[PDB]
Write a protein that binds this ligand. Structure first.
Ligand code: ADE
Length: 284
């Protein structure tokens, strides 16, 4: 292949430090895409080529309903273009802020979608490393579409790699092992999941401060509290995820993976099959 003139560009969906995402319609098919556009001069000058390459390589591996899809890539002299699925309802974070928190049914449903997504991702040997509500988009049907793969890692199957050495993430969601051991693992995403479940119920993530270093100090000490009213089985689940030892988090490989996590009592009423076809509960 496609070229820019094959599309009609509409509204700007997002502006980042080195990318712009624009809604577009492909003329020959009438399909809508979110097109992420990178200016080559800028990505070269600012040493972002590895992250752009990583995003393309990781997204090309993914095929599951709970991820943003990469349908095509093309470039011209100035720019690289990634054709992505359009998530019309934007970031999960927007809904947390607006409603303040989610009821139990909605927490359960969205948590189950995230767990299903992570099961798929980790089953492919990929760590996200920057899981957070801003990176969990919502499609027109209000199912999740996880994005932001330029800081993800494909663990090498040939070496049975478990640990990744790049320092990436977001302070509120970063795992203690990355801070203290300088590496992340698949279980690092389970720590982020714990933060996210907490945030859905309480309205804010559990380790928070106006300076990143203050957050790091709390993470490494497991310094957080629950508000007095927090759904008890969700509290139990969070306490099984926000564990300093990454080999002791429910869902991790050392604990036999996603079957035991899906078996947690908080999920007793979830039907895991065809979750992407179930009608999400309305957010109120
Ligand atoms: N795929 C997408 N859909 C909607 N907004 C986005 N912002 C970044 N990627 C997006």
């Amino acid at each position: 292949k496609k070229r820019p003139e094959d599309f009609k560009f509409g509204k700007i969906l997002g502006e980042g430090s080195f990318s712009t995402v624009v809604l577009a319609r492909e003329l020959a098919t009438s399909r809508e895409y979110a097109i992420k556009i990178l200016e080559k001069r800028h990505i070269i000058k600012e040493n972002k080529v590895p992250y752009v390459t990583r995003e393309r390589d990781v997204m090309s591996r993914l095929d599951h309903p709970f991820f943003v899809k990469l349908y095509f890539t093309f470039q011209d002299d100035e720019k690289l273009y990634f054709g992505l699925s359009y998530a019309k309802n934007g970031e999960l974070l927007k809904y947390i802020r607006k409603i303040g928190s989610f009821d139990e049914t909605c927490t359960r449903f969205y948590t189950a979608e995230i767990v299903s997504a992570l099961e798929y991702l980790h089953g492919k040997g990929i760590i996200h490393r920057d899981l957070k509500p801003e990176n969990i988009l919502l499609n027109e049907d209000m199912h999740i579409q996880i994005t932001d793969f330029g800081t993800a890692k494909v663990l090498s199957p040939e070496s049975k790699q478990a640990r990744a050495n790049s320092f990436v993430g977001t302070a509120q969601y970063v795992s203690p092992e990355l801070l203290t051991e300088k590496s992340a693992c698949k279980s690092s995403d389970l720590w982020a999941l714990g933060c996210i479940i907490y945030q859905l119920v309480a309205g804010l993530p559990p380790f928070r401060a106006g300076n990143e270093g203050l957050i790091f100090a709390k993470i490494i000490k497991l310094e957080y509290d629950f508000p007095e009213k927090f759904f008890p089985k969700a509290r139990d689940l969070v306490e099984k995820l926000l564990v300093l030892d990454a080999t002791k988090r429910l869902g991790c490989e050392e604990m036999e993976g996603y079957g035991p996590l899906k078996a947690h009592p908080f999920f007793e009423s979830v039907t895991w099959e065809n979750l992407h076809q179930q009608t999400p509960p309305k957010l109120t």
